[PDB]
Motif scaffolding. Structure first.
Motif, PDB file in Angstrom:
ATOM      1  N   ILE A 147     142.473  32.826  -8.421  1.00 41.75           N
ATOM      2  CA  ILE A 147     141.581  31.959  -7.601  1.00 41.75           C
ATOM      3  C   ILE A 147     141.882  32.158  -6.127  1.00 41.75           C
ATOM      4  O   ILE A 147     140.974  32.159  -5.271  1.00 41.75           O
ATOM      5  N   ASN A 148     143.158  32.305  -5.817  1.00 44.32           N
ATOM      6  CA  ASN A 148     143.510  32.604  -4.444  1.00 44.32           C
ATOM      7  C   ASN A 148     144.794  33.388  -4.447  1.00 44.32           C
ATOM      8  O   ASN A 148     145.533  33.437  -5.431  1.00 44.32           O
TER       9      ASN A 148
ATOM     10  N   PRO B 244     152.483  41.679  -6.998  1.00 49.30           N
ATOM     11  CA  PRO B 244     152.434  40.253  -6.661  1.00 49.30           C
ATOM     12  C   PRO B 244     153.346  39.423  -7.523  1.00 49.30           C
ATOM     13  O   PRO B 244     153.665  39.814  -8.692  1.00 49.30           O
ATOM     14  N   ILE B 245     153.753  38.278  -6.991  1.00 50.69           N
ATOM     15  CA  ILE B 245     154.244  37.163  -7.811  1.00 50.69           C
ATOM     16  C   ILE B 245     153.004  36.496  -8.424  1.00 50.69           C
ATOM     17  O   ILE B 245     152.092  36.153  -7.672  1.00 50.69           O
ATOM     18  N   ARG B 246     152.922  36.384  -9.750  1.00 50.96           N
ATOM     19  CA  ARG B 246     151.743  35.798 -10.370  1.00 50.96           C
ATOM     20  C   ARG B 246     152.101  34.525 -11.120  1.00 50.96           C
ATOM     21  O   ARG B 246     153.046  34.508 -11.938  1.00 50.96           O
ATOM     22  N   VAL B 247     151.413  33.439 -10.768  1.00 56.36           N
ATOM     23  CA  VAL B 247     151.633  32.141 -11.446  1.00 56.36           C
ATOM     24  C   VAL B 247     150.337  31.574 -11.919  1.00 56.36           C
ATOM     25  O   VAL B 247     149.268  31.905 -11.374  1.00 56.36           O
ATOM     26  N   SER B 248     150.406  30.729 -12.960  1.00 54.19           N
ATOM     27  CA  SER B 248     149.218  30.059 -13.425  1.00 54.19           C
ATOM     28  C   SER B 248     149.404  28.562 -13.193  1.00 54.19           C
ATOM     29  O   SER B 248     150.497  28.044 -13.341  1.00 54.19           O
ATOM     30  N   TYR B 249     148.317  27.897 -12.791  1.00 55.23           N
ATOM     31  CA  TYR B 249     148.362  26.470 -12.455  1.00 55.23           C
ATOM     32  C   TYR B 249     147.485  25.769 -13.444  1.00 55.23           C
ATOM     33  O   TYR B 249     146.305  26.074 -13.558  1.00 55.23           O
ATOM     34  N   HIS B 250     148.058  24.789 -14.135  1.00 57.01           N
ATOM     35  CA  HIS B 250     147.416  24.120 -15.275  1.00 57.01           C
ATOM     36  C   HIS B 250     147.238  22.628 -15.011  1.00 57.01           C
ATOM     37  O   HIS B 250     147.737  22.090 -14.028  1.00 57.01           O
TER      38      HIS B 250
ATOM     39  N   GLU C 155     149.839  35.255  -6.310  1.00 54.40           N
ATOM     40  CA  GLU C 155     148.492  35.139  -6.903  1.00 54.40           C
ATOM     41  C   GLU C 155     148.502  33.910  -7.782  1.00 54.40           C
ATOM     42  O   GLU C 155     149.389  33.788  -8.650  1.00 54.40           O
ATOM     43  N   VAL C 156     147.493  33.055  -7.646  1.00 56.70           N
ATOM     44  CA  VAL C 156     147.434  31.812  -8.441  1.00 56.70           C
ATOM     45  C   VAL C 156     146.234  31.908  -9.374  1.00 56.70           C
ATOM     46  O   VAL C 156     145.101  32.066  -8.913  1.00 56.70           O
TER      47      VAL C 156
END
Length: 129
Positions: free
Chosen positions: A99-100, A112-118, A90-91
Protein backbone atom coordinates in the motif's frame (compact mmCIF):
# COMPACT_ATOMS: atom_id res chain seq x y z
CA UNK A 1 -16.62 -8.27 10.87
CA UNK A 2 -17.61 -11.56 12.51
CA UNK A 3 -14.78 -13.82 13.76
CA UNK A 4 -15.41 -16.23 10.85
CA UNK A 5 -15.27 -13.43 8.25
CA UNK A 6 -12.07 -12.14 9.90
CA UNK A 7 -10.43 -15.56 9.68
CA UNK A 8 -11.58 -15.83 6.03
CA UNK A 9 -9.90 -12.49 5.27
CA UNK A 10 -6.66 -13.64 6.98
CA UNK A 11 -6.61 -16.99 5.20
CA UNK A 12 -7.39 -15.45 1.78
CA UNK A 13 -4.58 -12.91 2.22
CA UNK A 14 -1.96 -15.50 3.26
CA UNK A 15 -2.86 -17.71 0.30
CA UNK A 16 -2.96 -14.83 -2.20
CA UNK A 17 0.37 -13.53 -1.09
CA UNK A 18 1.94 -17.02 -1.28
CA UNK A 19 0.41 -17.81 -4.68
CA UNK A 20 0.83 -14.41 -6.38
CA UNK A 21 4.16 -13.28 -4.95
CA UNK A 22 5.73 -16.36 -3.36
CA UNK A 23 5.86 -14.54 0.02
CA UNK A 24 4.99 -16.09 3.38
CA UNK A 25 3.31 -14.24 6.28
CA UNK A 26 5.39 -15.16 9.33
CA UNK A 27 3.33 -14.72 12.48
CA UNK A 28 4.78 -12.44 15.14
CA UNK A 29 3.76 -12.58 18.77
CA UNK A 30 0.60 -10.52 19.32
CA UNK A 31 1.66 -8.00 21.82
CA UNK A 32 2.15 -4.28 21.62
CA UNK A 33 5.68 -4.77 20.29
CA UNK A 34 4.53 -6.45 17.06
CA UNK A 35 5.84 -3.68 14.73
CA UNK A 36 9.35 -4.03 16.23
CA UNK A 37 9.00 -7.82 16.19
CA UNK A 38 8.19 -7.81 12.46
CA UNK A 39 11.13 -5.51 11.69
CA UNK A 40 13.43 -7.59 13.91
CA UNK A 41 12.43 -10.71 11.95
CA UNK A 42 13.09 -8.86 8.69
CA UNK A 43 16.50 -7.51 9.76
CA UNK A 44 17.86 -10.18 12.14
CA UNK A 45 15.73 -13.17 11.26
CA UNK A 46 14.54 -13.25 14.88
CA UNK A 47 11.71 -11.37 16.53
CA UNK A 48 13.51 -11.72 19.87
CA UNK A 49 15.55 -8.67 18.74
CA UNK A 50 12.38 -6.53 19.02
CA UNK A 51 13.53 -4.50 22.08
CA UNK A 52 16.89 -3.77 20.42
CA UNK A 53 15.09 -2.59 17.27
CA UNK A 54 12.83 -0.38 19.40
CA UNK A 55 15.84 0.98 21.37
CA UNK A 56 17.68 1.76 18.16
CA UNK A 57 14.56 3.40 16.65
CA UNK A 58 14.18 5.59 19.76
CA UNK A 59 17.96 6.37 19.68
CA UNK A 60 17.63 7.41 16.06
CA UNK A 61 14.62 9.64 16.75
CA UNK A 62 16.34 11.34 19.70
CA UNK A 63 19.53 11.90 17.68
CA UNK A 64 17.39 13.48 14.98
CA UNK A 65 15.00 15.23 17.36
CA UNK A 66 15.18 18.61 15.53
CA UNK A 67 13.85 16.99 12.36
CA UNK A 68 11.38 14.62 13.99
CA UNK A 69 10.10 17.39 16.32
CA UNK A 70 8.49 18.83 13.17
CA UNK A 71 5.95 15.95 13.29
CA UNK A 72 4.99 15.38 16.89
CA UNK A 73 0.64 3.49 9.94
CA UNK A 74 3.37 4.31 12.61
CA UNK A 75 4.86 6.75 10.13
CA UNK A 76 7.56 8.30 12.33
CA UNK A 77 8.92 4.94 13.51
CA UNK A 78 8.76 3.49 10.01
CA UNK A 79 10.72 6.42 8.46
CA UNK A 80 13.29 6.11 11.24
CA UNK A 81 13.72 2.40 10.69
CA UNK A 82 13.93 2.62 6.92
CA UNK A 83 16.60 5.31 7.24
CA UNK A 84 18.52 3.56 9.98
CA UNK A 85 18.62 0.18 8.19
CA UNK A 86 19.11 1.81 4.77
CA UNK A 87 16.31 -0.33 3.32
CA UNK A 88 12.82 0.66 2.22
CA UNK A 89 9.93 -0.54 4.38
CA UNK A 90 7.02 -1.92 2.32
CA UNK A 91 3.66 -2.17 4.11
CA UNK A 92 1.12 -4.74 2.86
CA UNK A 93 -2.50 -4.40 3.99
CA UNK A 94 -4.55 -7.41 2.84
CA UNK A 95 -2.83 -6.63 -0.46
CA UNK A 96 -0.34 -8.48 -2.63
CA UNK A 97 1.44 -5.28 -3.61
CA UNK A 98 2.48 -2.73 -0.98
CA UNK A 99 0.00 0.00 0.00
CA UNK A 100 2.89 2.29 0.71
CA UNK A 101 6.65 2.26 0.88
CA UNK A 102 8.90 4.22 3.25
CA UNK A 103 11.90 4.82 1.02
CA UNK A 104 14.57 5.35 3.70
CA UNK A 105 17.63 6.74 1.92
CA UNK A 106 16.43 5.52 -1.52
CA UNK A 107 19.06 2.74 -1.55
CA UNK A 108 18.72 -1.08 -1.51
CA UNK A 109 15.29 -0.87 -3.18
CA UNK A 110 15.62 -4.54 -4.22
CA UNK A 111 15.98 -5.65 -0.55
CA UNK A 112 13.02 -4.06 1.22
CA UNK A 113 11.94 -4.72 4.77
CA UNK A 114 8.42 -6.12 4.17
CA UNK A 115 5.68 -6.08 6.83
CA UNK A 116 1.99 -6.76 6.80
CA UNK A 117 -0.48 -4.66 8.82
CA UNK A 118 -3.62 -6.40 10.01
CA UNK A 119 -6.85 -5.82 11.94
CA UNK A 120 -6.35 -4.87 15.61
CA UNK A 121 -3.17 -2.90 14.93
CA UNK A 122 -1.02 -5.96 14.38
CA UNK A 123 2.09 -6.40 12.22
CA UNK A 124 3.57 -9.56 10.76
CA UNK A 125 6.78 -10.21 8.80
CA UNK A 126 6.44 -10.85 5.04
CA UNK A 127 9.23 -13.30 4.09
CA UNK A 128 10.59 -14.12 0.63
CA UNK A 129 11.96 -17.65 0.87
Amino acid sequence: MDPATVEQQEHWFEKALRDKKGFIIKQMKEDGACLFRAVADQVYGDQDMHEVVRKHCMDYLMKNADYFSNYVGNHIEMQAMAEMYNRPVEVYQYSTEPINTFHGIHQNEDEPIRVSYHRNIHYNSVVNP
